[PDB]
Write an enzyme that holds these catalytic residues in place. Structure first.
Site, PDB file in Angstrom:
ATOM      1  N   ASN A   1       3.902   7.654 -13.029  1.00  0.00           N
ATOM      2  CA  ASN A   1       5.324   7.401 -13.289  1.00  0.00           C
ATOM      3  C   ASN A   1       5.639   6.915 -14.688  1.00  0.00           C
ATOM      4  O   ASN A   1       6.742   6.450 -14.959  1.00  0.00           O
ATOM      5  CB  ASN A   1       5.872   6.431 -12.239  1.00  0.00           C
ATOM      6  CG  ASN A   1       6.116   7.103 -10.935  1.00  0.00           C
ATOM      7  OD1 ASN A   1       6.316   8.324 -10.889  1.00  0.00           O
ATOM      8  ND2 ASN A   1       6.114   6.323  -9.849  1.00  0.00           N
TER       9      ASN A   1
ATOM     10  N   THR B   1      25.884 -25.205   7.373  1.00  0.00           N
ATOM     11  CA  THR B   1      25.003 -26.255   7.876  1.00  0.00           C
ATOM     12  C   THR B   1      23.960 -25.580   8.774  1.00  0.00           C
ATOM     13  O   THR B   1      24.317 -24.744   9.610  1.00  0.00           O
ATOM     14  CB  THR B   1      25.811 -27.327   8.659  1.00  0.00           C
ATOM     15  OG1 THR B   1      26.746 -27.959   7.771  1.00  0.00           O
ATOM     16  CG2 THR B   1      24.916 -28.413   9.243  1.00  0.00           C
TER      17      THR B   1
HETATM   18  C1  LIG Z   1       4.645  18.601 -20.113  1.00  0.00           C
HETATM   19  C2  LIG Z   1       4.140  18.471 -18.672  1.00  0.00           C
HETATM   20  N1  LIG Z   1       3.224  19.314 -18.184  1.00  0.00           N
HETATM   21  N2  LIG Z   1       2.677  20.204 -18.844  1.00  0.00           N
HETATM   22  C3  LIG Z   1       1.757  20.988 -18.268  1.00  0.00           C
HETATM   23  N3  LIG Z   1       1.400  20.829 -16.992  1.00  0.00           N
HETATM   24  N4  LIG Z   1       1.175  21.938 -18.984  1.00  0.00           N
HETATM   25  O1  LIG Z   1       0.240  22.731 -18.397  1.00  0.00           O
HETATM   26  C4  LIG Z   1       4.674  17.547 -17.764  1.00  0.00           C
HETATM   27  C5  LIG Z   1       3.919  17.220 -16.631  1.00  0.00           C
HETATM   28  C6  LIG Z   1       4.408  16.339 -15.670  1.00  0.00           C
HETATM   29  C7  LIG Z   1       5.668  15.759 -15.826  1.00  0.00           C
HETATM   30  N5  LIG Z   1       6.054  14.908 -14.843  1.00  0.00           N
HETATM   31  C8  LIG Z   1       7.289  14.479 -14.516  1.00  0.00           C
HETATM   32  O2  LIG Z   1       8.306  14.803 -15.131  1.00  0.00           O
HETATM   33  N6  LIG Z   1       7.293  13.587 -13.504  1.00  0.00           N
HETATM   34  C9  LIG Z   1       8.334  13.086 -12.789  1.00  0.00           C
HETATM   35  C10 LIG Z   1       8.000  12.345 -11.644  1.00  0.00           C
HETATM   36  C11 LIG Z   1       8.975  11.801 -10.811  1.00  0.00           C
HETATM   37  C12 LIG Z   1      10.335  12.003 -11.082  1.00  0.00           C
HETATM   38  C13 LIG Z   1      11.306  11.462 -10.218  1.00  0.00           C
HETATM   39  C14 LIG Z   1      12.736  11.201 -10.714  1.00  0.00           C
HETATM   40  N7  LIG Z   1      10.998  11.252  -8.917  1.00  0.00           N
HETATM   41  N8  LIG Z   1      11.787  10.797  -8.069  1.00  0.00           N
HETATM   42  C15 LIG Z   1      11.369  10.666  -6.800  1.00  0.00           C
HETATM   43  N9  LIG Z   1      12.158  10.163  -5.842  1.00  0.00           N
HETATM   44  N10 LIG Z   1      10.124  10.985  -6.489  1.00  0.00           N
HETATM   45  O3  LIG Z   1       9.670  10.819  -5.210  1.00  0.00           O
HETATM   46  C16 LIG Z   1      10.683  12.762 -12.219  1.00  0.00           C
HETATM   47  C17 LIG Z   1       9.693  13.303 -13.060  1.00  0.00           C
HETATM   48  C18 LIG Z   1       6.431  16.090 -16.954  1.00  0.00           C
HETATM   49  C19 LIG Z   1       5.941  16.992 -17.920  1.00  0.00           C
HETATM   50 MG   LIG Z   2       7.128   7.092  -5.886  1.00  0.00          MG
END
Ligand SMILES: C/C(=N\NC(=N)NO)c1ccc(NC(=O)Nc2ccc(/C(C)=N/N/C(N)=N/O)cc2)cc1
Ligand SMILES: [Mg+2]
Ligand SMILES: C/C(=N\NC(=N)NO)c1ccc(NC(=O)Nc2ccc(/C(C)=N/N/C(N)=N/O)cc2)cc1
Ligand SMILES: [Mg+2]
Lengths: 286, 286
Positions: free
Chosen positions: A128, A163
């Site tokens: 995260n 209370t």
């Molecule tokens: C550049 C790239 N990857 N490039 C690649 N694989 N090249 O081969 C890459 C890989 C992973 C991510 N991750 C990502 O963005 N996570 C993410 C995790 C959770 C959430 C949310 C809001 N969740 N909300 C809930 N409720 N969840 O349960 C939003 C985004 C971004 C870019």
């Molecule tokens: Mg989570």
């Protein structure tokens, strides 16, 4: 299945970038701009998550661009081209102490901002923490508010106005510790920091007979001297103040930010440089 | 101000019957039937209270007849012609042990039913126990679900499904005691029972130097031998099992109902007689 029509109207969907237990993250292109976005798909509390994401405004917290409530949930967010911190620390890999400090400073600023705004994240972990580029020196942003808690007036506060003639003793006992739920985020930060610095988890079932639960509740992390010898005393000291079992004694984000390890003008300069670099400002008066 | 038009359309409002901190209770007449009802006015969680009142169906829990959400909230309920238990026990007045047992049996049936249905009342007190008539032998009904809690899957349960790698120790510690919130109702019942039997409160600031909080958390109720001499050993024994400081050791409603004090066939017959008397049944097959 197919992507919902409203999403297709505005975006062209591409490759899978990552995945979780709840769904996956896709690359997409916004038609209007031809620019890349990330789309988090959550297979059918998302409504509160969206409400939180829309309200928050900090450079180290992900921003929501769009939301579609269809057969699944679709959350459109900025694309973090560096991907997850998880991939930098998996397989005993380890970041330079300087990189650890730069990322950790930003995690602290983000969590400080959450706590100031009455939000507890509750799921801080390397998956995260997203990185803005493939360069080591980069911005990070916290994501996933799927199990976050919004602080406000509690039932306990309402209880204490009257209370306690009919009130159970456990409720009065709970008063000693109430209002420290935010400390769970500081513990998680401590675990993340330990992992970044050492390339291994402080609490694990690996080659031990002490149960995971007992390791944690006792605060007895696995200290392997040879792994840590190359890490500064100051960095380990901060880890120790975050991995304190008593949530009232545990370092807050403010205390962590005041710690000697983070009194690093070089690191702070690098952060500020990275910030201004990111921003597309428009003209200002004077 | 005036009563809202929708309420006036269906009811003629009369005299004030009682009052609380949140508002008052009025006598009213339903125009359709010319029968008396009670209207609880709450000056502007009522929405959840209404949802709870509509779902529950037990002879010892008040029923909602109507609801109006206007300048204030108006909850229309059956009129309990005996009024509040509070007025029977105020000024050191005291009910015969037999009457105490009859009322307390019904309070226990009501609270048992709540707990079976995943509802914790959280405000049990003599003001919230209503009597069906001015006769000593009567039905009672529990009211006021304004601060009640609905049980369901907790965040903790979701937390325990995963590996606690990043999880704070206080969360694991909380597992030992989780799921006993319903015990606060059993404590309150114990205090009500103590008051009914003795005509005085177990915990009070009256003529003592021990703080209210310390009396409660220590479980050290005020025992005045001369007041209690006329009360049976069995009745006091039950009080003692309800006023237990450890919520996991405290008597549940099931345990209280199995206690020797409530193994009274005469009392149970009187209750059943009172029930059938209340009901306007309509013809049945066979
Ligand atoms: C550049 C790239 N990857 N490039 C690649 N694989 N090249 O081969 C890459 C890989 C992973 C991510 N991750 C990502 O963005 N996570 C993410 C995790 C959770 C959430 C949310 C809001 N969740 N909300 C809930 N409720 N969840 O349960 C939003 C985004 C971004 C870019
Ligand atoms: Mg989570
Ligand atoms: C016959 C009589 N009185 N007769 C008289 N005075 N003759 O001179 C009499 C007196 C008092 C009552 N009480 C009464 O009915 N309580 C009551 C309390 C609370 C609620 C509720 C639902 N509350 N919900 C919330 N959210 N609250 O905050 C409903 C009813 C009834 C009859
Ligand atoms: Mg109340």
């Amino acid at each position: 299945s197919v992507y919902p029509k409203a999403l297709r109207d505005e975006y062209i969907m591409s490759k899978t970038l990552g995945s979780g237990a709840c769904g996956e993250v896709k690359l997409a292109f916004e038609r209007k701009t031809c620019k890349k976005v990330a789309i988090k798909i959550i297979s059918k509390n998302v409504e509160t998550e969206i409400e939180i994401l829309k309200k928050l405004n900090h450079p180290c917290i992900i921003k929501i661009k769009n939301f579609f409530d269809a057969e699944d949930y679709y959350i459109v967010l900025e694309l973090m081209e560096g991907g997850e911190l998880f991939d930098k620390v998996v397989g005993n890999k380890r970041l330079k102490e300087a990189t650890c400090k730069l990322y950790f400073y930003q995690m602290l600023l983000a969590v400080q901002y959450l706590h100031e705004n009455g939000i507890i994240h509750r799921d801080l972990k390397p998956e995260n923490v997203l990185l803005s580029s493939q360069e080591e020196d980069c911005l990070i942003k916290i994501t996933d508010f799927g199990h976050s808690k919004i602080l406000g007036e509690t039932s306990l506060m309402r209880t204490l106005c009257g209370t306690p003639t009919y009130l159970a003793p456990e409720v009065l006992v709970s008063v000693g510790t109430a209002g420290y739920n935010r400390a769970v985020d500081c513990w998680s930060l401590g675990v993340i920091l330990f992992i970044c610095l050492s390339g291994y988890p402080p609490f694990s079932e690996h080659r031990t007979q002490v149960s995971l639960k007992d390791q944690i509740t006792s605060g007895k992390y696995n200290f392997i001297p040879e792994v840590w010898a190359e890490v500064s005393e100051k960095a380990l000291d901060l880890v120790k103040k975050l991995l304190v079992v008593d949530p009232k004694a545990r370092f807050t984000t403010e205390e962590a930010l005041r710690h000697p390890w983070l009194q690093d003008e070089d690191m702070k300069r690098k952060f500020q440089d990275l910030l201004s670099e990111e921003n597309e400002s428009t003209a200002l008066p004077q």
